[PDB]
Design a protein around this ligand. Sequence first.
Ligand SMILES: Cc1n[nH]c(C)c1-c1ccccc1N
Ligand SMILES: Cc1n[nH]c(C)c1-c1ccccc1N
Ligand SMILES: [Cl-]
Ligand SMILES: [Mg+2]
Ligand SMILES: [Mg+2]
Ligand SMILES: [Mg+2]
Ligand SMILES: [Mg+2]
Lengths: 194, 194
Amino acid sequence: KQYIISEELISEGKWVKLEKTTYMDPTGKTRTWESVKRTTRKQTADGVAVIPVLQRTLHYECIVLVKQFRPPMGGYCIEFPAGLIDDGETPEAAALRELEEETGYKGDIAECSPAVCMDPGLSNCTIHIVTVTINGDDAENARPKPKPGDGEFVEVISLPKNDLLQRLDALVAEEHLTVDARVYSYALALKHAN
Amino acid sequence: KQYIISEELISEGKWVKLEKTTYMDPTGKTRTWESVKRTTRKEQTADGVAVIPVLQRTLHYECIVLVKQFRPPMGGYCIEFPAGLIDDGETPEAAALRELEEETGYKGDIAECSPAVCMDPGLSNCTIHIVTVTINGDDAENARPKPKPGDGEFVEVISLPKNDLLQRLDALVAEEHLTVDARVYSYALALKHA
Ligand SMILES: Cc1n[nH]c(C)c1-c1ccccc1N
Ligand SMILES: Cc1n[nH]c(C)c1-c1ccccc1N
Ligand SMILES: [Cl-]
Ligand SMILES: [Mg+2]
Ligand SMILES: [Mg+2]
Ligand SMILES: [Mg+2]
Ligand SMILES: [Mg+2]
């Protein structure tokens, strides 16, 4: 019933662009919407977010998270390991690559989501949420070495799965950090499931 | 270690603006970052709220109440948590309860409210409070929930069981052409993994 009529370019940067989307509402009236987009997409989605489950025997299962300075936020944020998918790359391969680059861990694919939207009121940005198990007992994951690219500066924070929300709340309280919405939504559901 | 140096405007629309952010990296080098921001924010702790509405009913499995909406940036329909911006002077809990009633028709009760969490921190400064709300479906006020949508709002309600959320979300994705929200998918994945 609703559909895109046309798109006007307001201001295109190098990486980000701002468009004025004109769309048909379900009654019949025409309405406008300043939509946001990325220029880097070719591709199933823009990027991937890795839910990395660190499994070590006789230890609590941990979720591997990344702390980075984020200039749009103007501060540090706790997030799932993540990054854009390169040209000629399946979402599963981008997940294992980004996981190793940012954390140093070599993981195995458990499952992969379809394209899911990030902030659909604001932007068109999508990701594949990729669940990855990491064998922490394997010798390749004994001394994990992050391989950061030019510009990335990532700090690894592994928190136990069984108390993820409470440990995230503790980090917000004593270090002024902004936890990611998807990380928080995941941590909430872990507690709510019971 | 890392901090904001300056923020110069590239373009400002009625609702969204694009800024050229300059920041210091941890090696001591100056770098730039195109950052997206909303013009509607002012004194609020976050831009908006996302409602995780747990519909509770005697001799019913708990349901998560979701909303289906055409989203002009995505160019199609999206399945999301009920959500909207926080009005000036409005507390996050009141915004959550109002938006839930407007989009679904349900009168909820506050369970818990998250701190400000980032929506897409590589792209924008946008934040929300994730407000968990219980809905007493046995109450007479929640018997015939009538959505009260504002100007330009056209919301359909989709209530799915909590114990089978991910599979029911996948079943909707296979049947029709629509995108599931990343926070909703993250929530459903956690319910599986717990
Ligand atoms: C979403 C949303 N919530 N509140 C407003 C004013 C918007 C908006 C409207 C058109 C284009 C971009 C926006 N960010
Ligand atoms: C995020 C991200 N992934 N890849 C690039 C080039 C960006 C980016 C960098 C600075 C400002 C805006 C952006 N979208
Ligand atoms: Cl798993
Ligand atoms: Mg990254
Ligand atoms: Mg990387
Ligand atoms: Mg809304
Ligand atoms: Mg609304």
